[PDB]
Amino acid sequence: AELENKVAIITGACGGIGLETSRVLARAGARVVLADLPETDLAGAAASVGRGAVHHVVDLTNEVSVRALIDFTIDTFGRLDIVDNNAAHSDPADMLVTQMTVDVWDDTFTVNARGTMLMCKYAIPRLISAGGGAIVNISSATAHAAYDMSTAYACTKAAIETLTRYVATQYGRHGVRCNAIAPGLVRTPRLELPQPIVDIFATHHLAGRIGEPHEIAELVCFLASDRAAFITGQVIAADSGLLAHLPGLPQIRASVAEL
Amino acid sequence: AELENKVAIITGACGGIGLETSRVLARAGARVVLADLPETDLAGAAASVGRGAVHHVVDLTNEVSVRALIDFTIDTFGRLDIVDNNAAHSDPADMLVTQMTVDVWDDTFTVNARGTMLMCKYAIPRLISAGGGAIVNISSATAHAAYDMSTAYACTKAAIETLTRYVATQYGRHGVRCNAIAPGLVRTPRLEVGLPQPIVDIFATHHLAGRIGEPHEIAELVCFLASDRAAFITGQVIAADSGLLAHLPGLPQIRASVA
Amino acid sequence: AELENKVAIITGACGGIGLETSRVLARAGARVVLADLPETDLAGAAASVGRGAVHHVVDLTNEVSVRALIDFTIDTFGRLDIVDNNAAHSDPADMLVTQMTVDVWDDTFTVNARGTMLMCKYAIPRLISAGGGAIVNISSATAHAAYDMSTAYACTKAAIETLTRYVATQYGRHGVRCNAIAPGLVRTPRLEPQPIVDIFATHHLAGRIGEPHEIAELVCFLASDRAAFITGQVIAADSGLLAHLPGLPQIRASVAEL
Amino acid sequence: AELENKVAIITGACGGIGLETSRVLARAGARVVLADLPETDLAGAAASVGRGAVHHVVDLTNEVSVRALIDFTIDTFGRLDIVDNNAAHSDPADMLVTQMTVDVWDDTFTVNARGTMLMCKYAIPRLISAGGGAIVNISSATAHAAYDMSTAYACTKAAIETLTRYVATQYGRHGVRCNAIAPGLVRTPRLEVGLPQPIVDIFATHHLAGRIGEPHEIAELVCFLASDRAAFITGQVIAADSGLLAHLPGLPQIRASVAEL
């Protein structure tokens, strides 16, 4: 059991990737705390995961709420070993820089950058008390390669990537590891961008398809585990080599096939 | 001359690097506008720069003030070709993740991340009307490699690096280039009061030239990246850090042990 | 069983990292083929791994020999799923750029760059015939950060990092993944000048050098269906060696003084 | 001017990027030495550059020849300040991994990786005698982003980026800078005989300025990194590729689609 006995918190737990992750971590022996906003079916989520899974509301914009979540984990299990900072805000008016408003921008940084920082701020000493532990932060390929939307979101993911290196560095000596995952496109309900945009993206993933939630859950599980004890402060792409190839490859292939 | 007849905004112009960037840009032929907080001596900086350099106050935390800066420039010169987003907030209580307060975090993100974004928001329309132009955003080595201080600062610079890519991708078809510089340690008045000498000296050893940087050595890179010589360089993050991060840690101790 | 039913080839299988990667993969349920030079004790390494591990010589400088290894695996087990390109030549005359001899450079490139390419050249069509599979290439942190020795070696690992992307790019459509691992300092016999080893140890964030098993686990993960959506990557198993500013320990000691 | 009184060796000096980098370095005040294989027209290239440019044959595959080029420069000029390792072999048989031959591979690595190490090996001591100096190594976008051809070429370039980091680290202390430039598609005579047009047009749309580069846009970046304006830039790999690798792959067709949607 790769995570035998560890206590894990997953944020954004009612989301596509968040639910599946909680599942995989439970399946590997962890006692999972599912966390998400009050409006969501946390209870249905936890019931579905099973394996002793519990749940508690969290609002990353609220330092006291972020703190209440960790303190609840400690009330319930007496310890904390693992945290998947998976939650993320993405406003649909997050388009072009010239079109950016301060509200869309600030809402997105408050949840994503500040909130993840707060989660680390209060998780870390618990990890240290436990004898060491693991934080996995979810970033995104969008931090590394741009397009005509998600400017705020993208930039917050970049902040989180640097935040990963700071946690890893400052707390390595106390036995805490921190890594980040930059996923490519993953089939979620927050997807189900229109179909022909998805089809376009799909051709540029080297498997020829978008990812499935469990393919991110499996890297979270691994990075959260002792098998990764010499892996820290890294950003690891789970994106089917989206950025490993020259752009224009699919149409160069079609072109070569003609000529 | 490299920037003949170009109109340039330098924010943080009273600072070590910004004042010096102002000199090199104006020495390379630019009509420069020096901008910084109202309690700074903008009059004196513009005087010391000469060559028809002007000055206008700006408060990056305030969109009105950003709007007012860009418009002053257009009222005065009728065009805008270059922006150097050089201003940066850096709080002395900006220490460890676990010690972070939301006030230190937001102050920093409001000036650095949001402010730079607001500067790009209003400058881009004008640069397009020039028939293309350049934006240089200052980042920092610290975004890429961590230590026990400047976490918030570090994370905001990460954000500006992604922003830079988004600005390049979005407005390349309209003749706008955007690049970021990532300085190593650079000798400024901020620096002398931030770090004590023994630690500065330690850092100096990990720069391959065996010394820390001088402001003008960052200014020249700004100048090249803002100039038409960089016509085919856009969306990059370029380190001016004496290969601070190009060598294995422990090199000087390895070398000392070899002697 | 993370790799139940898979056939794997490990090169440099008698080495510290290669042997201990062989155990782990075998423990995961893979049928493993240990490959190394004829003067190494392959049978004893295969014995120590057990679990049906077999062995066969290979000289990575020689194309015929690489072919013979792939063909041996295929004729034995009827398939191939995993290749850990772990073998590496590391010459002790490999010092500074201005002292470099063509012999040391070429010797190092022939085994590491050309050799890794030849293993891929002939594994790829087989992995394709198996429905798809994974290749893992061992790089080195030294490719991204220089010092006063190992110049040829680091340069060959960079070439390997590029090879990895090409393999992953060219053959992704046909079911083949390829990823690279860049280790920090790991404890082996080849390793064992102590004063240098402890200096390096302070700059790994665990404050120690790596263990071979800690590289093995990552090869294992990357060779498995759990990594189905990871490909073309270079991943650091270096305890954050390059995620922090250099000078950190010395800064921390100065801060413990003042 | 930016390289006043500085002595510069440029390899591959008859090729599109080489010849144009020679002119620019020379326009910037450098005493330039054009170096390329004996079957190229070095005399014509130096006549084109003017400004006192000289020429001399080199074969990167021959250690005795690399040394002879460095010894010639010192004989003529008494010093060496700048080397632009621009020469690269690039073989049309260099297609896919599964199709790679040992000869295509070895020929490419002997010229590109080994050749460039030998240039530095013989140049660096002279850069140190002159009180410090600058090396600029030419790489390629293709070491970072893979496609269906030029595997070997691309791996040698990767080797050269790490090599750059090793020169920079080993000789920083003695006053020697070393950087690399990774170009995107640049209009040269070789792309006119290398890739067909409809493939050039596809690549062109993925470069953010909506076109392939010109050789001078590379030359200017070489010029700057060779000069004392770059004194605190060392060990880097800088892309002059109009952000070919800063955007999501598929952007142009996503834009085509979003306009129809």
Question: Per-residue DSSP letters for D124-135?
Answer: HHHHHHTT-EEE
Is residue A119 within 8 Å of residue A164, measured between CB atoms?
A: no
List CB contacts (< 8 A) between C159 and chain D.
109, 113, 155-156, 158-159
Specify the residue for token string 């051809």: D149
Residue (of D109, B151, B177, D260) closest to C110 by Cα position: D109
Q: Cα–Cα–Cα angle for A15, A19, A20, nearest 5°?
A: 120
Specify the residue for token string 């189900």: A192
Residue of A nearest to D141 (CA): A246
Two structure tokens written together for D175:
């006053």
Interacting residues of B78 by C-beta distance below 8 A, sequence separation 6+: none
Is residue D115 within 8 Å of residue D158, measured between CB atoms?
A: no
Q: In angstroms, what separates the C-alpha of C4 from chain D's closest C-alpha? A: 27
C147 included as an active-site residue: no
A145 touches chain B (CB under 8 A): yes
Euclidean distance between CA atoms D90 and D103, whole angstroms: 12
Q: Which residues pair with B183 in a beta bridge?
A: B240
Q: Give me the CATH topology for the region D1-243.
A: Rossmann fold (3.40.50)
Alpha-carbon distances of A198 from A181, A192, B204, D250, rounded to whole Å: 21, 10, 49, 11
Euclidean distance between CA atoms B240 and B236, whole angstroms: 13
Is residue B4 within 8 Å of residue B31, measured between CB atoms?
A: no
Q: Which residues pair with B34 in a beta bridge?
A: B10, B55
Is residue B225 within 8 Å of residue B25, measured between CB atoms?
A: no
Q: If DSSP codes are grouped into helix, strand and coil, which group holds residue C237?
A: strand
Q: If DSSP codes are grouped into helix, strand and coil, which group holds residue C72?
A: helix
User: Rounded to 5 degrees, what are φ and ψ at A14?
Assistant: -85, -5
Interacting residues of A120 by C-beta distance below 8 A, sequence separation 6+: A83, A85, A135, A163, A167, A178, B97, B98
How many other CB atoms are found less than 10 A from the CB of residue B4? Answer: 10
Q: Using only C-alpha atoms, what is the Rg of chain C?
A: 18
Start-to-end Cα distance in chain A: 54
Residue (of B170, A259, A144) closest to D201 by Cα position: A259
Is residue D117 within 8 Å of residue D163, measured between CB atoms?
A: yes
How many other CB atoms are found less than 10 A from the CB of residue A48? Answer: 13
Q: How many residues does chain C have?
A: 258
B197 touches chain C (CB under 8 A): no
Euclidean distance between CA atoms B82 and B71, whole angstroms: 14
List CB contacts (< 8 A) between C230 and chain A.
219, 236-240
Q: In angstroms, what separates the C-alpha of D251 from chain B's closest C-alpha? A: 9
Euclidean distance between CA atoms D70 and D126, whole angstroms: 8
Euclidean distance between CA atoms A97 and C238, whole angstroms: 37
A29: left (phi over 0), alpha (psi -120 to 50) or beta: left
How many other CB atoms are found less than 10 A from the CB of residue C164? Answer: 30
D245 touches chain A (CB under 8 A): yes
Buried b (16+ CB within 10 A) or exposed e, C208-246: ebbbbbbbbbbbbbbbbebbbbbbbbbbbbbbbbbbbbb
Euclidean distance between CA atoms A85 and A120, whole angstroms: 9
Interacting residues of D248 by C-beta distance below 8 A, sequence separation 6+: A141, A142, A145, A146, A147, A201, A204, A242, A247, B169, D254
Is residue D195 within 8 Å of residue A256, measured between CB atoms?
A: no
Two structure tokens written together for C179:
């990823």
Work out the burial of residue B47: count CB atoms within 10 Å of its CB; fewer than 13 is exposed, 13-18 middle, 19 or more buried. Answer: exposed
DSSP, res A228: G
Q: Which helix (H) or strand (E) holds B114?
A: none
Q: Cα–Cα–Cα angle for D126, D128, D134, nearest 5°?
A: 85
Q: How many residues does chain D have?
A: 261
Q: Cα–Cα–Cα angle for C18, C20, C25, nearest 5°?
A: 90
Euclidean distance between CA atoms B74 and B122, whole angstroms: 12
Q: If DSSP codes are grouped into helix, strand and coil, which group holds residue A178?
A: strand
Euclidean distance between CA atoms D23 and D21, whole angstroms: 5
Is residue C130 within 8 Å of residue C78, measured between CB atoms?
A: no
Q: If DSSP codes are grouped into helix, strand and coil, which group holds residue D177?
A: strand
Residue (of C165, C76, C82, C157) closest to C119 by Cα position: C82
Euclidean distance between CA atoms B68 and B137, whole angstroms: 20
Domain A1-241 grouped into CATH 3.40.50.300: no
Residue (of A67, A71, A50, A180) closest to A115 by Cα position: A67
User: Contact A148/D202, CB-based, under 8 Å?
Assistant: no
Q: If DSSP codes are grouped into helix, strand and coil, which group holds residue B3?
A: coil
Euclidean distance between CA atoms B31 and B26, whole angstroms: 6
Domain residue extents for chain B? 1-243
Is residue D24 within 8 Å of residue D220, measured between CB atoms?
A: yes
Q: Which helix (H) or strand (E) holds A212?
A: none
Euclidean distance between CA atoms C100 and D206, whole angstroms: 40
The correct CATH number of C1-240 out of 3.30.420.140, 3.30.70.260, 3.40.50.720, 3.30.43.10 is 3.40.50.720
C236 touches chain A (CB under 8 A): yes
Is residue B116 within 8 Å of residue B139, measured between CB atoms?
A: no
Q: Which helix (H) or strand (E) holds C73?
A: helix C63-77
Alpha-carbon distances of B163 from A156, B110, B125, D251, rounded to whole Å: 10, 14, 16, 17
Euclidean distance between CA atoms A176 and A173, whole angstroms: 7
Q: In angstroms, what separates the C-alpha of D78 from chain C's closest C-alpha? A: 20
Q: In angstroms, what separates the C-alpha of C183 from chain B's closest C-alpha? A: 13
Euclidean distance between CA atoms A87 and A37, whole angstroms: 10
Q: How many CA atoms lie within 13 A of A252 on its CB side?
A: 24
Count residue pairs from B and C with Cβ separation < 8 A. 81
Residue (of A124, A133, A143, A219) closest to A181 by Cα position: A219
State this model's resolution in angstroms.
2.5
Count residue pairs from A and D with Cβ separation < 8 A. 89
Euclidean distance between CA atoms D112 and D159, whole angstroms: 9
Specify the residue for token string 């190394």: C36
How many other CB atoms are found less than 10 A from the CB of residue C131? Answer: 10
DSSP, res B165: H
Is residue D102 within 8 Å of residue D153, measured between CB atoms?
A: no
Measured in whole angstroms, the distance separating CA B163 from the mean position of its chain's CA atoms is 13
Euclidean distance between CA atoms C174 and D51, whole angstroms: 55
Q: Which of C27, C205, C245 to mutate to probe the A interface, most A CBs <10 Å?
A: C205
